[PDB]
Amino acid sequence: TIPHLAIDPFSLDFFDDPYPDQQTLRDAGPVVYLDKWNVYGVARYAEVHAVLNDPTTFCSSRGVGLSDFKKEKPWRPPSLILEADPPAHTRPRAVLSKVLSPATMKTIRDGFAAAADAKVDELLQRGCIDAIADLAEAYPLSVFPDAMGLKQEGREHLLPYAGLVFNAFGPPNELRQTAIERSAPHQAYVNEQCQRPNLAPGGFGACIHAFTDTGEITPDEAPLLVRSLLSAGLDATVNGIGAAVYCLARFPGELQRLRSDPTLARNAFEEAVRFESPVQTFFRTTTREVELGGAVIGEGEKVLMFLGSANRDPRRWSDPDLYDITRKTSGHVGFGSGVHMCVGQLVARLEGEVMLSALARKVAAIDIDGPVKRRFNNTLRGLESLPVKLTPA
Numbered sequence: 001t002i003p004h005l006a007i008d009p010f011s012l013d014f015f016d017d018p019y020p021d022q023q024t025l026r027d028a029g030p031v032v033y034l035d036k037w038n039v040y041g042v043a044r045y046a047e048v049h050a051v052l053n054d055p056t057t058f059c060s061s062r063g064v065g066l067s068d069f070k071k072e073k074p075w076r077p078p079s080l081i082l083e084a085d086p087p088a089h090t091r092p093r094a095v096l097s098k099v100l101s102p103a104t105m106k107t108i109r110d111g112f113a114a115a116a117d118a119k120v121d122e123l124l125q126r127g128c129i130d131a132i133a134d135l136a137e138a139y140p141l142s143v144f145p146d147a148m149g150l151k152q153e154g155r156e157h158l159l160p161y162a163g164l165v166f167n168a169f170g171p172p173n174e175l176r177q178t179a180i181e182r183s184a185p186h187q188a189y190v191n192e193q194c195q196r197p198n199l200a201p202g203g204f205g206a207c208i209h210a211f212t213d214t215g216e217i218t219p220d221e222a223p224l225l226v227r228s229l230l231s232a233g234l235d236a237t238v239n240g241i242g243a244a245v246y247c248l249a250r251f252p253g254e255l256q257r258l259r260s261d262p263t264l265a266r267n268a269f270e271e272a273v274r275f276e277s278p279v280q281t282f283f284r285t286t287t288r289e290v291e292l293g294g295a296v297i298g299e300g301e302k303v304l305m306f307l308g309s310a311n312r313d314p315r316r317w318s319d320p321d322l323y324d325i326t327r328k329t330s331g332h333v334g335f336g337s338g339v340h341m342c343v344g345q346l347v348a349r350l351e352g353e354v355m356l357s358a359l360a361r362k363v364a365a366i367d368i369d370g371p372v373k374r375r376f377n378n379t380l381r382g383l384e385s386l387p388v389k390l391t392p393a
């Protein structure tokens with residue numbers, strides 16, 4: 001049978017320390033039922049990977065939040081890529097894959113690297129930073145909106161709106177109702193910024209629009225894809241970088257290894273993505289009755305995937321609670337898995353790689369310099385404040 005648990009994965013206590021409850025979720029069985037929200041849940045690597053790699057049984061077109069779009073009206077027009085299934089998902093997926101492709105990385109790498117190095121040097125002209133306010137947020141705010149091709153102003157909308165989106169994937173708790181209620185202004189700005197005239201060419205958004213004459217996407221779809229990049233392209237990377245700095249502070253041996261060989265920077269970042277999993281959870285909806293882990297789930301049921309749990313499953317990872325910058329990270333689900341696997345993962349890995357490389361070449365020590373404060377969000381895991389003293393190299 002399926003065990004029934006009262007754990008609330010969208011409660012502040014859970015956000016404050018999810019790992020005990022995540023173990024309870026893994027050990028209760030391959031498939032659990034969360035009575036708090038009447039949803040099924042999967043927290044082991046095996047089942048998370050199985051669900052992710054069966055997107056037509058466990059579909060996304062009925063929403064990847066708790067809300068089932070077949071039963072409730074979406075708070076915003078459904079995402080044409082995240083909240084779509086094959087075949088509708090194809091050509092937007094391919095378009096964003098070409099926009100955020102290797103070649104585009106070739107076009108943005110030097111700028112991103114210069115911005116990273118420059119921020120690290122600016123903060124060595126500081127010493128005692130809040131690694132969130134001064135580094136994790138500042139850098140992606142200083143590079144990503146430009147890479148999107150957004151006008152200089154209104155970029156401030158980006159952090160709110162993104163956050164809003166991620167709070168909206170959660171249940172109707174006070175975080176979600178907090179986010180959605182009267183968020184109109186952001187919704188306005190974003191809507192206006194997704195239009196071709198307001199996006200500087202050569203940026204990601206203008207390239208999306210540019211692809212509208214190829215027959216993969218139509219002109220009415222481009223603004224929603226620009227919206228997608230503007231919603232998923234900032235806060236996740238912020239929390240990811242904050243996670244990387246956090247780990248390097250908590251595992252000084254790993255910082256020393258990284259300094260010794262800056263070429264591990266990329267894998268360092270990847271390990272942080274596994275270790276903290278900035279995107280903690282995502283939902284699917286069953287399109288039919290389906291058997292998973294010896295249990296049977298009815299049609300039209302929400303299934304909650306615990307990505308961070310899958311990334312700390314001792315059934316899959318040796319020493320899962322240890323940050324190891326030489327760990328082989330292939331197979332982790334911090335970026336998802338399958339047809340929906342993060343189409344912008346090269347951008348995230350670029351930002352994190354160049355930031356951790358800057359730290360590696362320019363910083364000798366990172367020692368937490370105050371109270372660590374967590375940032376609470378229905379979907380995202382990250383830090384509100386990470387006070388550290390940076391000792392230069």
Ligand code: HEM
Pocket residue numbers: 060064081082083093096100228229232233234236237240273277278279282307333334335336337339340341342343344345347348
């Ligand atoms: C550390 C940084 C990041 C993390 C942890 C992350 C995480 C994820 C995950 C787990 C998914 C799978 C969603 C699902 O299966 O339902 C996803 C999809 C997606 N991500 Fe990211 N992401 C990051 C950075 C970015 C960036 C920088 C961009 C864009 C510039 C981006 C844009 C997207 C988009 C558009 C999708 C939807 C892809 C699809 O549905 O086919 N993400 N991301």
Ligand SMILES: CSc1ccc(C(=O)O)cc1
Pocket residue numbers: 079080081082083165227228229231232279
């Ligand atoms: C994985 S977080 C995320 C991804 C995509 C979208 C979107 O397509 O709007 C929103 C959030």
